[PDB]
Design a protein around this ligand. Structure first.
Ligand SMILES: *[C][C@](*)([N]C(*)(*)(C(*)(*)([O])C(*)(*)([O])C(*)(*)(*)([C]O(*)P([O])(=O)O*)O*)C(*)(*)(*)=O)=O*
Ligand SMILES: *[C][C@](*)([N][C]([C]=O)[C@@](*)([O])C(*)(*)([O])C(*)(*)(O*)[C](*)O(*)P(*)(*)(*)([O])(O*)=O*)=O*
Ligand SMILES: [Cl-]
Ligand SMILES: [Cl-]
Ligand SMILES: [Cl-]
Ligand SMILES: [Cl-]
Lengths: 222, 222
């Protein structure tokens, strides 16, 4: 299971500066040396390289675009199969009811419980009712990952109104909740932990130097 | 010359997981894409790799320990020759009063002016005394890099007492002053720019994921 603490997302998609399974394994080692107690990573090859380098538990995804779908976080059984091969401890997937290329959300959950009974699953959601649906499906973790990143949650950000969206998710499910997406500062990490999340996932504030540089430069442009 | 803005320090010493000229070149590219105006980098190999990746001005150093000296930032003519071969725009050196392994600070300044007359020089200092000595020797930039990192500045940190050390350096020299070392947050960066520094160098807060991770974890331990 994932401990209570800081999970660091070590991702760099194609054309991002640090894109490389090797570089993400070194970002994961850096995060481990700083006190991370889990890693979130994208693709079997990045997961495998990270697991060569740290024993941390890993939340695995495969981000892969499909024609005729807006679902890109572990969209089909093809991505699930790669993640079962990677032997990541947790498989995370988009848990919205948007149109998928192949299997439905219920079919993917069933598929993982059948082909990988020892792996926990994490639901990446954007709404409270998507969080409630994920808890009913038996997800082990429910993450705020897609809040503001679907066409129906545009302009919304996790920290708005003293984390009101997160408070609503925490009130609506008894499953372990993960604060993920837009946990930008240590102050925000402390706030979401004090509100009662199981753990928090921090990517851009630790492992995306372009995004941290932008927050420095932006303080001078206001 | 160095513009007015954010210089990102893209360093990873041999003990650090991200040690690599390739990885530091990608840190510099990310920094460029986020709005950095320059890069600070360590060793000829890293500087050359960065200068093939971005057109930004580079502040070059060679960190190299010597027996019988506490000076480790560009300590001798050996390091200066490596930086002249690098073609970095600015050469930075320890500009403390500490005994060096070979040439004195005054001899190394004369050496650079003779053998690299088109390069600017930057003084890494620890004290107001050392800033005034650097202005005597004609340094183009004077940075606060070593403040708190010498046996005679123990417990001192740039941000203490609302940047009183930086205010004292700014009052004591006409040269271009660089806030470098323990500029940890965009709020600090804005404060030092508001106090009248020419530019600021930020390293650990952008390009050391272990150090950023530690600030997240520490918030929960306090
Ligand atoms: C919306 C989306 N997010 C993915 C990822 O790129 C994010 O970086 C992580 C971590 O969030 P930040 O805001 O801490 O970077 O969720 C999800 O893995 O595609
Ligand atoms: C005192 C010391 N500093 C080095 C100087 O180049 C760098 O490691 C340091 O990262 C750099 O000066 C920027 O400082 P911050 O504190 O932002 O990392 O060895
Ligand atoms: Cl980045
Ligand atoms: Cl800038
Ligand atoms: Cl080279
Ligand atoms: Cl690091």
């Amino acid at each position: 299971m994932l401990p209570h603490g800081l999970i660091v997302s070590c991702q760099a998609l194609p054309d991002e500066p640090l894109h490389s399974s090797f570089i993400m394994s070194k970002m994961a080692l850096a995060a481990y040396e700083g006190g991370a107690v889990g890693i979130r990573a994208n693709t079997k090859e990045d997961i495998l390289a990270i697991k060569e380098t740290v024993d941390l538990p890993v939340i695995g995804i495969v981000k892969r675009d499909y024609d005729h779908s807006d679902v890109f976080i572990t969209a089909t059984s093809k991505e699930v199969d790669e993640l079962i091969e990677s032997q990541c401890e947790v498989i995370a997937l988009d848990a919205t009811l948007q149109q998928r290329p192949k299997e439905t959300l219920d079919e993917l959950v069933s598929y993982i419980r059948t082909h990988a009974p020892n792996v926990e699953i994490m639901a990446d959601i954007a709404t409270v009712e998507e969080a409630k649906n994920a808890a009913r499906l038996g997800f082990d973790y429910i993450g705020t990952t897609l809040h503001g990143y679907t066409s129906y949650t545009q302009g919304q950000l996790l920290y708005q109104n003293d984390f009101q969206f997160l408070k609503d998710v925490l009130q609506s499910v008894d499953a372990k909740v993960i604060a993920e997406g837009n946990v930008i500062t240590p102050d925000m990490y402390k706030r979401v932990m004090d509100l009662g999340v199981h753990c928090s996932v921090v990517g851009g504030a630790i492992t995306r130097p372009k995004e941290i540089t932008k927050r420095f430069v932006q303080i001078m442009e206001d």
